[PDB]
């Protein structure tokens, strides 16, 4: 399948080179997989989710996304027009308030929730969790991330937007998950993207168009936008049977575009998410 005039990020994921406009992907599109977007929530009513999105847990008075962030990330995972895995099942877990903030205890709780909740969802092709959030180093947050991964979930987390080594940020610094950096349209490391040895992969993160609340759309930047590309790619690949939740991150790294990014510091992988789709 081919999506013409797709967001640059989608087109980059199905290309060996930057600057293309079509997103090529297998028609299965992540059917049968499930992705938990652990964020500010998901506007499930947005037409772009076509009924494939549902809120399953909130740690606040309401399950509504009063911010937009969570909706945008969910959109990049699986909305019709802006998503990597267009047929995946989206589950919203609101651990961030409407200002985009959340206590670590709450974020930890959300991760444990997903580890248990998946045991009662129908996801024959696998489960993925996308965490476009982060803060200072925390052994407890990292352990929660590691537990979620160990439980059988493909965890993708943002590297952080501090233009620094991700070793000082959580859950970015947890080795066993998939830590994602951001890149721009010209294959440059996003100016704000964290780097370092703990990074596993890069995804499109600068000027990323996706869904927003109020049934709208908008472009924003962050490692937060790169993360759901990798989460969506994992789901896509798991549905195709190419990999599993436990191995998806290294499978994506194995098959990434190599050596294409600029301003990558010594000690950081030069690998960019790639679906290797051959019509």
């Amino acid at each position: 399948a081919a999506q013409t005039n797709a967001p640059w990020g989608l087109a980059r994921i199905s290309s060996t080179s930057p600057g293309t406009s079509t997103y090529y992907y297998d028609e299965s599109a992540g059917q049968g997989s499930c992705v938990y977007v652990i964020d500010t929530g998901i506007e499930a009513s947005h037409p772009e989710f076509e009924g494939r999105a549902q809120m399953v847990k909130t740690y606040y008075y309401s399950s509504r996304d009063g911010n937009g962030h969570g909706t945008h990330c969910a959109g990049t995972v699986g909305s019709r027009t802006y998503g990597v895995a267009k047929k995946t099942q989206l589950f919203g877990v609101k651990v961030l308030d409407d200002n985009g903030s959340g206590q670590y205890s709450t974020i930890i709780a959300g991760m444990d929730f997903v580890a248990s909740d998946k045991n009662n969802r129908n996801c024959p092709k696998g489960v993925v969790a996308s965490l476009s959030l982060g803060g200072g180093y925390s052994s407890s947050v990292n352990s929660a991330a590691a537990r979620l991964q160990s439980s059988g979930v493909m965890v993708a987390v943002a590297a952080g937007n501090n233009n620094a080594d991700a070793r000082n940020y959580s859950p970015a610094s947890e080795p066993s998950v998939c830590t994602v950096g951001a890149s721009d349209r010209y294959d440059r490391r996003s100016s704000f993207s964290n780097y370092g040895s703990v990074l596993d992969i890069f995804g499109p993160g600068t000027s990323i168009l996706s869904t927003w609340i109020g049934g709208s759309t908008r472009s924003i930047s962050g490692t937060s936008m790169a993360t759901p590309h990798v989460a969506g790619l994992a789901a896509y690949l798991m549905t195709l049977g190419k990999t599993t939740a436990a191995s998806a991150c290294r499978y994506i790294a194995d098959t990434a575009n190599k050596g294409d990014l600029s301003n990558i510091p010594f000690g950081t992988v030069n690998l960019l998410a790639y679906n290797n789709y051959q019509a």
């Binding site: 964020d39 985009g100 206590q103």
Partner: peptide, 10 residues
């Protein structure tokens, strides 16, 4: 716009 938030670590 990007990321989220921190502290406490349960």
């Amino acid at each position: 716009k990007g990321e989220a938030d921190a502290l406490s670590l349960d």
